[PDB]
PDB file of C-alpha atoms (C1' of nucleotides) in Angstrom:
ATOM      1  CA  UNK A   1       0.000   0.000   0.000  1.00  0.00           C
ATOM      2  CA  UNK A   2       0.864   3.692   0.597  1.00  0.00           C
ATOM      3  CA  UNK A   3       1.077   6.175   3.376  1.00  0.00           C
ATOM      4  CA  UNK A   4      -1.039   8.958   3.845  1.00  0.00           C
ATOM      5  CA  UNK A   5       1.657  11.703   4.105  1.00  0.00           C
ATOM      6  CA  UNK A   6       4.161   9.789   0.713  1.00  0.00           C
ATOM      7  CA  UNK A   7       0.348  10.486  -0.896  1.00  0.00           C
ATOM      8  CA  UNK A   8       0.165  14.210  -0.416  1.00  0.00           C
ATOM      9  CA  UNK A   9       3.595  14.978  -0.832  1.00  0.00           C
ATOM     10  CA  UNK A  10       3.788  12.970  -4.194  1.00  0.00           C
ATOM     11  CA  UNK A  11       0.773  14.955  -5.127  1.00  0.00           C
ATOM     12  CA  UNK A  12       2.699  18.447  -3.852  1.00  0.00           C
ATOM     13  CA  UNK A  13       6.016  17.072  -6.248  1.00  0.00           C
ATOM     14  CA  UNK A  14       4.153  16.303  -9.112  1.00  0.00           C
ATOM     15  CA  UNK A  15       1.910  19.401  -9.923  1.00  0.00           C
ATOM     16  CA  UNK A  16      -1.482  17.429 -10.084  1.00  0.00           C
ATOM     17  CA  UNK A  17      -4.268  18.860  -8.337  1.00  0.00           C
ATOM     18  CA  UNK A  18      -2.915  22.550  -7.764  1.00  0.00           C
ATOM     19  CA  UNK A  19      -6.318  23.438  -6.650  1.00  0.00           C
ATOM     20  CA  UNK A  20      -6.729  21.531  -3.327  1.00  0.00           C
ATOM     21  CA  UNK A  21      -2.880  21.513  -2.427  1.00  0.00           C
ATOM     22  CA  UNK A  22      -0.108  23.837  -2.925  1.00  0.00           C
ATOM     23  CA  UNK A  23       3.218  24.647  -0.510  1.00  0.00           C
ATOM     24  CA  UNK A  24       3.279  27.258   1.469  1.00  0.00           C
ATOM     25  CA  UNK A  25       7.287  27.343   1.684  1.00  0.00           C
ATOM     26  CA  UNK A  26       8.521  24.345  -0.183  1.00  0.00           C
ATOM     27  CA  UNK A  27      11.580  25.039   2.467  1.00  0.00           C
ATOM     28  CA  UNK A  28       9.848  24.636   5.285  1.00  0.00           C
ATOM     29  CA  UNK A  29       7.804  21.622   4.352  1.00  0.00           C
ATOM     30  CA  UNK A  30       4.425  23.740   4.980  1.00  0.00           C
ATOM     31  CA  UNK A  31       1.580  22.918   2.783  1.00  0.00           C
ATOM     32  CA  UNK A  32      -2.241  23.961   2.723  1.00  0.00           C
ATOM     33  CA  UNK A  33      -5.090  22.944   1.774  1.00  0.00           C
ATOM     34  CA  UNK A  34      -8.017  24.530  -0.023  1.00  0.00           C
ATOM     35  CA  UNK A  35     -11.057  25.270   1.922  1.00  0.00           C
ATOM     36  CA  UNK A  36     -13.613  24.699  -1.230  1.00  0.00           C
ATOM     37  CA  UNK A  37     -11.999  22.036  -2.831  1.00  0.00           C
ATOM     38  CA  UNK A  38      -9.880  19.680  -0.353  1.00  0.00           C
ATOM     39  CA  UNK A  39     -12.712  17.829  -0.921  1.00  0.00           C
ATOM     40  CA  UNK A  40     -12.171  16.366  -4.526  1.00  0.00           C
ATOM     41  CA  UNK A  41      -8.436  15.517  -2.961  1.00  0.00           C
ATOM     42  CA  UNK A  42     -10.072  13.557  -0.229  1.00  0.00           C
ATOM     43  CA  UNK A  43     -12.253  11.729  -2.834  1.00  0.00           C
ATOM     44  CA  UNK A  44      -9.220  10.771  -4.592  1.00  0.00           C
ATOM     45  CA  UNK A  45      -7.273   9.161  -1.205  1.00  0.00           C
ATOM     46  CA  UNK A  46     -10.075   6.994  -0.498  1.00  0.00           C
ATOM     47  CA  UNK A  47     -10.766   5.558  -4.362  1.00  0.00           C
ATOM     48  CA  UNK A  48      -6.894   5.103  -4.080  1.00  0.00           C
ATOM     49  CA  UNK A  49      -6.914   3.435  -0.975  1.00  0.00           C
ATOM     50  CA  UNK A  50      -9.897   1.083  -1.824  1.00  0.00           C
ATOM     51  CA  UNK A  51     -11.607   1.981   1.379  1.00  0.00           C
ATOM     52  CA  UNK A  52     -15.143   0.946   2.095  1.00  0.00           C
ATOM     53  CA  UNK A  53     -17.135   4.720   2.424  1.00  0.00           C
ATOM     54  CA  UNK A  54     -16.544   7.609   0.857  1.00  0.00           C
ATOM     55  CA  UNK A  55     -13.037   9.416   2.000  1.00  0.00           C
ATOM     56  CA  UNK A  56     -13.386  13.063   3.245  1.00  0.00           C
ATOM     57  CA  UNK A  57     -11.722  15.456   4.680  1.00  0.00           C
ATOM     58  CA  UNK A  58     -12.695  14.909   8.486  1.00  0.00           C
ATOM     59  CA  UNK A  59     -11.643  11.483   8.019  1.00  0.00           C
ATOM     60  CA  UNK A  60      -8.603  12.610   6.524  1.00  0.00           C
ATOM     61  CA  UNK A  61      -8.146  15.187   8.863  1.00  0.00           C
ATOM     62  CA  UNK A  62      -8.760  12.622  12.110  1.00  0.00           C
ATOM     63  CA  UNK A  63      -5.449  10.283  10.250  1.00  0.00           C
ATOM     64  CA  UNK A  64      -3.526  13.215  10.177  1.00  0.00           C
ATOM     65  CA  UNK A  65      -3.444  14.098  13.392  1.00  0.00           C
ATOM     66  CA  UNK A  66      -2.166  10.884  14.169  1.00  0.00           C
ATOM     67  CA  UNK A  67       1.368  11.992  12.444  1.00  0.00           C
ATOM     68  CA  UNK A  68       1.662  14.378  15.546  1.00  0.00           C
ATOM     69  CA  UNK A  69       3.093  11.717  17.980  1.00  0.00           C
ATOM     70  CA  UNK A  70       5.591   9.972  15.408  1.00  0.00           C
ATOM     71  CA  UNK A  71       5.933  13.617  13.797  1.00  0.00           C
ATOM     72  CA  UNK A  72       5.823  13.102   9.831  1.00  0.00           C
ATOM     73  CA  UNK A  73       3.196  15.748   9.733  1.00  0.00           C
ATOM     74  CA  UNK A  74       2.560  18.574  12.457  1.00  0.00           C
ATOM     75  CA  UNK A  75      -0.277  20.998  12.561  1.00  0.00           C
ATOM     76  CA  UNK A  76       0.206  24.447  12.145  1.00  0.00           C
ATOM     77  CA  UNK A  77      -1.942  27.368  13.635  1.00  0.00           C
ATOM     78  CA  UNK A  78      -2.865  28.456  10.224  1.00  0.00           C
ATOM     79  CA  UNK A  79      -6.251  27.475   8.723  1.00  0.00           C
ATOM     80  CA  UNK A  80      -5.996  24.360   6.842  1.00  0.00           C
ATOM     81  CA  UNK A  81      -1.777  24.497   7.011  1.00  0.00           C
ATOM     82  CA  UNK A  82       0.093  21.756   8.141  1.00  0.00           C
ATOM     83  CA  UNK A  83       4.079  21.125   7.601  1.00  0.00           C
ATOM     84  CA  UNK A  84       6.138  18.199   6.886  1.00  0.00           C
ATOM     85  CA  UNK A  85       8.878  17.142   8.643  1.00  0.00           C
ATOM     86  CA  UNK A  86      12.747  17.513   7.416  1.00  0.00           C
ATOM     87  CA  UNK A  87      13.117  13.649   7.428  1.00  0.00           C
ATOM     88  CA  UNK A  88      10.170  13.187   5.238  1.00  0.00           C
ATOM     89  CA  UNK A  89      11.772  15.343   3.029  1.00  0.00           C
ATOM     90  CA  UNK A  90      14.663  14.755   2.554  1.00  0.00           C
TER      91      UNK A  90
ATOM     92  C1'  DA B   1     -24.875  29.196  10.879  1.00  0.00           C
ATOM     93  C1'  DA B   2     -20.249  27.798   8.694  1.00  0.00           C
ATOM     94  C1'  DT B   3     -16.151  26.100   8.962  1.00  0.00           C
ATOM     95  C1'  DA B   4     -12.354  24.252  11.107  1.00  0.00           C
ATOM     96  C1'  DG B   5     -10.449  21.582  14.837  1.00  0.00           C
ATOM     97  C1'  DG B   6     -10.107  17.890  18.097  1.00  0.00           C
ATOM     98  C1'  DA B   7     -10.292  12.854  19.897  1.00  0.00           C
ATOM     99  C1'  DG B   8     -11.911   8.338  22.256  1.00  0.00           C
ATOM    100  C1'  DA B   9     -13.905   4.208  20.778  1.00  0.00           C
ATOM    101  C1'  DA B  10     -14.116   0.409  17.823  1.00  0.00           C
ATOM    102  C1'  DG B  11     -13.395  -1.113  13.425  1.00  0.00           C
ATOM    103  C1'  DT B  12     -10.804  -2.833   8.733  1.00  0.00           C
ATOM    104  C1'  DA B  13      -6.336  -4.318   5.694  1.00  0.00           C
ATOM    105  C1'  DG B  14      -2.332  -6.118   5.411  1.00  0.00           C
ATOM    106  C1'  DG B  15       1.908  -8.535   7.301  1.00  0.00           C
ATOM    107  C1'  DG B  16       4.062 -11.256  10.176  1.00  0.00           C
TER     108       DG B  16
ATOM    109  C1'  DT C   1      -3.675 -18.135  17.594  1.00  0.00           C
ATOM    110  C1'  DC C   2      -2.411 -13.447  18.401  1.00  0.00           C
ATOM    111  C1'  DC C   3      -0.417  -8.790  17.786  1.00  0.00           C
ATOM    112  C1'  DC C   4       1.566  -4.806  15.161  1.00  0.00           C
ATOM    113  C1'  DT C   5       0.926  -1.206  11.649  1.00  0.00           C
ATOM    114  C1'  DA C   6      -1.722   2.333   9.477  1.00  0.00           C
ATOM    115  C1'  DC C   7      -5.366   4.173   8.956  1.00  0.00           C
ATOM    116  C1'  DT C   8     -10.835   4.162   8.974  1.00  0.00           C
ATOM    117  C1'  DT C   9     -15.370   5.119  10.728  1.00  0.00           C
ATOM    118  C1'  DC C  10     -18.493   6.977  13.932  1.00  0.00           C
ATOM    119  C1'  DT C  11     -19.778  10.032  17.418  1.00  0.00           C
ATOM    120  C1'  DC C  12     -19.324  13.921  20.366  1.00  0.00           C
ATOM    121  C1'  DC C  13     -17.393  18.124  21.959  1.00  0.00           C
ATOM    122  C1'  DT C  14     -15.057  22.631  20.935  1.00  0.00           C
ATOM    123  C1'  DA C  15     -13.241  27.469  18.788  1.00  0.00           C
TER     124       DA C  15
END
DNA sequence: AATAGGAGAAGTAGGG
DNA sequence: TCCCTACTTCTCCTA
């Protein structure tokens, strides 16, 4: 399979849906999301994943804020920001 | 009212 | 026979 965060950030590398995800300082590993259409991105995780329901972003949301103990993705006080880390990066 | 944010509980998929 | 990993799903509260 594939991890949530190698999903996003393959998404961030390769251009493809500019309108639900772009960096917010490709230096400092922040991304954001788009308030009106994060939505089609979640779609997109779930169909990908095979999961039963439809993915959304709640749900997506709720897995990312598992990343905070390990630390491959960290919230950030910004509205729908978060930030990878500099191992994932690299 | 809207939207974002949070999390405990219990569950599935996949691998060992 | 059971547990670990990595989410997933539902529900409820909160800012």
């Amino acid at each position: 399979k594939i991890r949530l965060y190698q999903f996003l950030l393959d998404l961030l590398r390769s251009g493809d849906m500019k309108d639900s995800i772009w960096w917010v300082d490709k230096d400092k590993g922040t991304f954001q999301f788009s308030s009106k259409h994060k939505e089609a991105l979640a779609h997109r995780w779930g169909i990908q994943k095979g999961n039963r329901k439809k993915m959304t972003y709640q749900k997506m949301a709720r897995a990312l804020r598992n990343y905070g103990k390990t630390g491959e993705v960290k919230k950030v006080k910004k509205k729908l920001t978060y930030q990878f880390s500099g191992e994932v990066l690299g």
